[PDB]
Amino acid sequence: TSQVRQNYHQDSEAAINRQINLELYASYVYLSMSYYFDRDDVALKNFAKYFLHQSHEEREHAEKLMKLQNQRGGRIFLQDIQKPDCDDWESGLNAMECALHLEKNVNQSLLELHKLATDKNDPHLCDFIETHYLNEQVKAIKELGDHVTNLRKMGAPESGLAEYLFDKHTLG
Amino acid sequence: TSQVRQNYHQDSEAAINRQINLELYASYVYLSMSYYFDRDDVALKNFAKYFLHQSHEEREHAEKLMKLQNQRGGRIFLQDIQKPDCDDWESGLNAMECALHLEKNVNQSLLELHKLATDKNDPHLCDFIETHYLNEQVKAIKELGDHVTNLRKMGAPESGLAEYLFDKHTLG
Amino acid sequence: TSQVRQNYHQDSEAAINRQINLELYASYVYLSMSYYFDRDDVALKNFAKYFLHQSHEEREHAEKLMKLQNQRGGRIFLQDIQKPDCDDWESGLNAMECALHLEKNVNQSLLELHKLATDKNDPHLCDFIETHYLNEQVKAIKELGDHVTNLRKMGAPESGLAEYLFDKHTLG
Amino acid sequence: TSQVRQNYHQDSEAAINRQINLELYASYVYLSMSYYFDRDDVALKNFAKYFLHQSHEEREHAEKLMKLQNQRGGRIFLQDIQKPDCDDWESGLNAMECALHLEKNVNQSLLELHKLATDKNDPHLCDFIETHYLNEQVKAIKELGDHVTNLRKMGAPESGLAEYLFDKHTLG
Numbered sequence: 001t002s003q004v005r006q007n008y009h010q011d012s013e014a015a016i017n018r019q020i021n022l023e024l025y026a027s028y029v030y031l032s033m034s035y036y037f038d039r040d041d042v043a044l045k046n047f048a049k050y051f052l053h054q055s056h057e058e059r060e061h062a063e064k065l066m067k068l069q070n071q072r073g074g075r076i077f078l079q080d081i082q083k084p085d086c087d088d089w090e091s092g093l094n095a096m097e098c099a100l101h102l103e104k105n106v107n108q109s110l111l112e113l114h115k116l117a118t119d120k121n122d123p124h125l126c127d128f129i130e131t132h133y134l135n136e137q138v139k140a141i142k143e144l145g146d147h148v149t150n151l152r153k154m155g156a157p158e159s160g161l162a163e164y165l166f167d168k169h170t171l172g
Numbered sequence: 173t174s175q176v177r178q179n180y181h182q183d184s185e186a187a188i189n190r191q192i193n194l195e196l197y198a199s200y201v202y203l204s205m206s207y208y209f210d211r212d213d214v215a216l217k218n219f220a221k222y223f224l225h226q227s228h229e230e231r232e233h234a235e236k237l238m239k240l241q242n243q244r245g246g247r248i249f250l251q252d253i254q255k256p257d258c259d260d261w262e263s264g265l266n267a268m269e270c271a272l273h274l275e276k277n278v279n280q281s282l283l284e285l286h287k288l289a290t291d292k293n294d295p296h297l298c299d300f301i302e303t304h305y306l307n308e309q310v311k312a313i314k315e316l317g318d319h320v321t322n323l324r325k326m327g328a329p330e331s332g333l334a335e336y337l338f339d340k341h342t343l344g
Numbered sequence: 345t346s347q348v349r350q351n352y353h354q355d356s357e358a359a360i361n362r363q364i365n366l367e368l369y370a371s372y373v374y375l376s377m378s379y380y381f382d383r384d385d386v387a388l389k390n391f392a393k394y395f396l397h398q399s400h401e402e403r404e405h406a407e408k409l410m411k412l413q414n415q416r417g418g419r420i421f422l423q424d425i426q427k428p429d430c431d432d433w434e435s436g437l438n439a440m441e442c443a444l445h446l447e448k449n450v451n452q453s454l455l456e457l458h459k460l461a462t463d464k465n466d467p468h469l470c471d472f473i474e475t476h477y478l479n480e481q482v483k484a485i486k487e488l489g490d491h492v493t494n495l496r497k498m499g500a501p502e503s504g505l506a507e508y509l510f511d512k513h514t515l516g
Numbered sequence: 517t518s519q520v521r522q523n524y525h526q527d528s529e530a531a532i533n534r535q536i537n538l539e540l541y542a543s544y545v546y547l548s549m550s551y552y553f554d555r556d557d558v559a560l561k562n563f564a565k566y567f568l569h570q571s572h573e574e575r576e577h578a579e580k581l582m583k584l585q586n587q588r589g590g591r592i593f594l595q596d597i598q599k600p601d602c603d604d605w606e607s608g609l610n611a612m613e614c615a616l617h618l619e620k621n622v623n624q625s626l627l628e629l630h631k632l633a634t635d636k637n638d639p640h641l642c643d644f645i646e647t648h649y650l651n652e653q654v655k656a657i658k659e660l661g662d663h664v665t666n667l668r669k670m671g672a673p674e675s676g677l678a679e680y681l682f683d684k685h686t687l688g
């Protein structure tokens with residue numbers, strides 16, 4: 001090559017393509033979690049609305065990176081989007097616990113990409129990550145920790161009244 | 173010094189400086205209690221907002237006295253602001269119980285200063301205290317008593333659902 | 345540990361606790377400077393309002409760091425807040441000169457914390473500092489330099505008319 | 517008363533009549549000071565407007581006491597209103613210095629009346645004084661101290677530019 005490409009390393013380009021896939025995959029997990037709470041034998045409508053919004057967010061995270069790639073003169077190479085690992089997610093608390101784990105995993109990936117940009121001396125990539133992904137990631141993780149703590153102290157998942165009230169008063 | 177000083181006793185002046193410190197210290201305690209409820213392993217956001225507001229109030233109580241001192245022609249002498257005694261505050265109820273104790277202690281100090289003003293025949297200081305601090309203090313203590321009673325009757329602190337609901341329905 | 349803690353070093357955590365104290369201390373200095381200009385034998389009301397606002401700013405700087413600590417999964421450990429070093433601040437110019445010195449000292453601390461974050465490879469902490477503290481610090485220092493220059497060229501502190509006019513036309 | 521008189525002592529009544537005279541007299545002093553600054557060989561129009569407003573205030577202070585007297589069932593006995601002691605007031609600073617002295621003298625009178633009410637066990641008179649006169653008096657004295665300090669530090673009265681600027685920037 002592009003007439004526009006400048007100080008953009010191959011390794012950086014490839015790592016962007018992997019991140020794009022990870023984010024797409026995270027969107028998928030969340031999509032799954034959402035319609036799980038919409039089942040008639042589950043029926044926690046605010047849980048459902050919470051993971052649907054999360055699902056849309058993650059999609060937007062990917063499309064931003066797709067945009068960054070073209071901007072720097074790289075080429076987008078897409079891969080399959082894997083099946084979320086679970087079909088059944090058991091309870092409200094369990095689902096929150098799996099989302100916390102998911103987000104911590106996305107942050108390592110992002111911490112690794114940032115260390116690579118640094119090594120390649122790509123200050124434009126470093127700030128992009130720092131500015132649009134890292135602060136969003138710590139605020140996400142703190143929020144899911146808050147949620148898990150509350151559910152747990154209320155007595156979930158053994159208490160059905162506890163997930164019902166949390167759905168109403170916190171997620172509502 | 174002062175060209176303005178009139179019927180203002182040394183002892184009164186010194187006692188004002190001590191009160192200023194006590195109020196500053198109370199602000200500090202409350203500041204501590206607030207970020208304790210903002211921890212991910214605690215997470216009671218309305219508890220947090222309640223002690224943060226309390227923290228700001230106390231700061232305003234000090235600055236008012238700083239203002240009274242200059243007005244009467246005294247001189248402000250500041251001292252260190254001590255570490256709150258606790259780092260961990262254990263539960264919602266415990267924290268409310270410590271705040272009740274704190275406020276009762278601030279009121280004795282104020283009752284003692286008022287008795288001193290009386291002894292020194294300083295009617296201007298007497299009304300100032302009576303008007304800006306004593307009624308605010310009894311309304312504060314009654315309110316924390318109300319809170320402690322409710323938390324206790326709901327079954328706190330052994331009940332996590334109890335502090336969760338109180339945070340939502342009373343402090344919210 | 346916290347379920348939320350990730351790539352957050354002990355040393356980083358401890359350094360945050362020290363910064364929190366420094367900022368609290370800066371708030372205290374400024375609080376002192378303010379009621380010094382409110383004395384009947386000083387009486388420069390805009391000087392007073394200027395350091396009171398500065399005082400509130402610094403408090404907000406601390407509370408932000410308190411927030412960052414919880415967010416990253418660290419624990420807040422508070423220490424005593426030391427007596428400002430001066431009780432009397434002599435003149436308008438002197439007070440501005442002491443504030444310039446204070447701010448330069450806060451910036452070194454912040455430059456040192458940033459170098460530590462870098463060493464520990466904590467890109468999230470690096471941007472936080474860079475984004476909320478370093479640019480605010482250089483704009484603060486430049487502004488106090490401007491003020492000191494003007495006071496000095498007007499003929500302060502030997503000229504009382506000079507501090508009176510500056511209070512009116514610049515700080516007003 | 518009188519069918520209305522209750523727990524109102526003779527001595528209290530008489531002391532009210534004296535206070536009424538003192539306030540009337542203070543109004544007169546201020547009236548004099550005002551037209552002194554309106555002279556073509558003086559001409560400090562904001563000085564003039566400041567003592568005219570002060571003059572009206574003092575008149576209102578008297579009329580309030582006249583009202584208190586009737587309310588308690590006492591009888592108003594009026595006396596002559598003495599000539600202010602000065603015809604010429606020399607300068608801006610001098611006039612402010614004489615007003616400070618005047619106000620300190622009015623406050624002693626009020627402190628003495630309050631001690632009398634206390635001795636006679638007249639809680640209604642005590643609060644009346646405390647509430648409508650003592651806090652107004654300390655705020656008055658502090659303000660005139662501020663003014664005297666500023667005039668003095670600017671170099672008045674030897675500096676004509678100093679009183680001119682003060683009239684413009686502070687009293688304006």
Ligand SMILES: [Ca+2]
Pocket residue numbers: 082083
């Ligand atoms: Ca597959």
Ligand SMILES: [Ca+2]
Pocket residue numbers: 254255424
């Ligand atoms: Ca200590």
Ligand SMILES: [Ca+2]
Pocket residue numbers: 298299302642643646
């Ligand atoms: Ca009273």
Ligand SMILES: [Ca+2]
Pocket residue numbers: 252426427
């Ligand atoms: Ca010390």
Ligand SMILES: [Ca+2]
Pocket residue numbers: 598599
């Ligand atoms: Ca006569």
Ligand SMILES: [Fe+3]
Pocket residue numbers: 023026057058061106
């Ligand atoms: Fe994402």
Ligand SMILES: [Fe+3]
Pocket residue numbers: 195198229230233278
């Ligand atoms: Fe208080």
Ligand SMILES: [Fe+3]
Pocket residue numbers: 367370401402405450
């Ligand atoms: Fe600061």
Ligand SMILES: [Fe+3]
Pocket residue numbers: 539542573574577622
């Ligand atoms: Fe009066």
